[PDB]
Amino acid sequence: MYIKQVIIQGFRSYRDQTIVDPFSSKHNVIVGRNGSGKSNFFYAIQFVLSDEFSHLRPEQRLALLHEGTGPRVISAFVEIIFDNSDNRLPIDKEEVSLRRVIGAKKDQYFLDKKMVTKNDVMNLLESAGFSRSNPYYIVKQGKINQMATAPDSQRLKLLREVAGTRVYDERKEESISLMKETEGKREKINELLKYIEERLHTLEEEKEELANKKALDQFVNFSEQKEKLIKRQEELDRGYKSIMELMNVLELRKYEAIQLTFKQVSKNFSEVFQKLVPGGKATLVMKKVDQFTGVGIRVSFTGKQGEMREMQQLSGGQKSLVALALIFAIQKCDPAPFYLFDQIDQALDAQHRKAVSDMIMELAVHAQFITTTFRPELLESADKFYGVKFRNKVSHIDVITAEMAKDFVED
Amino acid sequence: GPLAKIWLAAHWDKKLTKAHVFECNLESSVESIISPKVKMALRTSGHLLLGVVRIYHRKAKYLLADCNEAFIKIKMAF
Numbered sequence A: 001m002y003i004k005q006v007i008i009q010g011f012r013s014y015r016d017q018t019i020v021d022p023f024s025s026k027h028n029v030i031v032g033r034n035g036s037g038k039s040n041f042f043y044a045i046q047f048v049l050s051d052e053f054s055h056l057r058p059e060q061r062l063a064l065l066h067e068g069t070g071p072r073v074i075s076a077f078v079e080i081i082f083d084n085s086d087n088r089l090p091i092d093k094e095e096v097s098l099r100r101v102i103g104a105k106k107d108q109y110f111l112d113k114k115m116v117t118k119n120d121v122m123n124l125l126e127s128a129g130f131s132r133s134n135p136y137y138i139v140k141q142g143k144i145n146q147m148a149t150a151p152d153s154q155r156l157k158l159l160r161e162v163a164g165t166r167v168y169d170e171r172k173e174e175s176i177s178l179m180k181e182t183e184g185k186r187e188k189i190n191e192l193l194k195y196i197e198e199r200l201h202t203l204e205e206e207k208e209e210l211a212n213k214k215a216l217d218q219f220v221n222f223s224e225q226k227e228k229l230i231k232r233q234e235e236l237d238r239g240y241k242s243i244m245e246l247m248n249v250l251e252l253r254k255y256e257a258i259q260l261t262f263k264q265v266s267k268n269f270s271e272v273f274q275k276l277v278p279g280g281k282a283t284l285v286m287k288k289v290d291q292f293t294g295v296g297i298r299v300s301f302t303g304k305q306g307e308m309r310e311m312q313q314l315s316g317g318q319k320s321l322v323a324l325a326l327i328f329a330i331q332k333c334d335p336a337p338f339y340l341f342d343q344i345d346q347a348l349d350a351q352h353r354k355a356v357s358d359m360i361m362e363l364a365v366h367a368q369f370i371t372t373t374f375r376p377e378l379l380e381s382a383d384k385f386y387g388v389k390f391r392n393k394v395s396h397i398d399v400i401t402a403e404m405a406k407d408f409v410e411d
Numbered sequence B: 001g002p003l004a005k006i007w008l009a010a011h012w013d014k015k016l017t018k019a020h021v022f023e024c025n026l027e028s029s030v031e032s033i034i035s036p037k038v039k040m041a042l043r044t045s046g047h048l049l050l051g052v053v054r055i056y057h058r059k060a061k062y063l064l065a066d067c068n069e070a071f072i073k074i075k076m077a078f
């Protein structure tokens, strides 16, 4: 499912209610001046979906209401509307309407106009393929900087997070708790099937010495109903032993998780790079919990020679590109339905700007993108175009033609 | 496949009916998590592991309900 439409009212630079024209299912690109309201829009989406913003302090409540001239608002909302024309959202509508409203001492979701709990939402989303474990459906230049400069250690702190080796344990515990809560029922069950078993056994000897009454008539029914339960307990007693085979095999595979996601992401890494920088050669190096101390990068833009450079010896935008390659290789290892990009080409020239725009034209066939740029290359790969103006203390976002967007980033 | 049901059981579990809980084979739902055709992130193997255990819980949840009516029905006529 993708993002069909968004509605904002009272949220940051968006005082009056704004209703964005419905998105392309592929590459949407937003353009605007400084302080215009691009990154504010992306924050509104995040206010609804992103797991961090689920539990808000009382001051972040205030730093979201439009603060300005007029009657300083006391509640703001955002509504996302998902195109469910793939039924990835477990719901029998073609459109799902999820919205969140907030004030001071007030925070409530609304699934298709009925209230729900914050936990309800995070489960509805997880089952559409949209992890709360996944931070990469949204990339700001904050993260591309932070990732190009980052040391070899911080990048290993990133595989341990991608292997999911921590959420697995979070679930694996949620599982063993039920498993025991259920194993309680089984001893209650296995006990009533001992009363019924022996109460039915004497009821049969009573029946035979005749060779009160309404129990004697339908004894064979009690007998027949009982052996049907015995069948069901033997189902449990057998699925239990089965769940144990499973739990056993997963703990074996958690201890192969980190070494595993490394090889995949290393392979994906070199793939993404060799088509961003056709001719190039890049690779991840595991280096000395475990004896793993870091994950470093070895890039050779220059064809592939004895001009490999460890990554901090790369140029400044060369580090930007490689950080972008790594973010691409990781998303391949964990796709999301739609991706938000906030000024990613900001440090790359015009040639690497194209190569990133090209490689997004490829990923657009299979997922939704909404992005913001200042240069005309992420504009050819695009399918719909928006502008953000700031007009009268507030933000306006409207549809522009493709030349309206190029005339804005080339003047 | 069947993993769609287990998946649904782990998160949006209220879309599973008693008939789905009963008809569901835990033994073979496990068989298709352990041997997946598209080997999966450990993060989603644990999502599945939870979906299974939900069903196993809910099976026992019904059996124990049934097993008590069976006890009080015959403890009554007798």
Ligand SMILES: Nc1ncnc2c1ncn2[C@@H]1O[C@H](COP(=O)(O)OP(=O)(O)OP(O)(O)=S)[C@@H](O)[C@H]1O
Pocket (backbone or CB within 6 Å): A011, A012, A013, A032, A033, A034, A035, A036, A037, A038, A039, A040, A041, A063, A064, A065, A066, A067, A068
């Ligand atoms: N709570 C708020 N109430 C009113 N205005 C706000 C609030 N928070 C931020 N702003 C202003 O919203 C305007 C736009 O915010 P942004 O969305 O970050 O614009 P922008 O397009 O990202 O600009 P860039 O990233 O420098 S190109 C800025 O002038 C902010 O000062």
Ligand SMILES: [Mg+2]
Pocket (backbone or CB within 6 Å): A039, A040
């Ligand atoms: Mg910004």
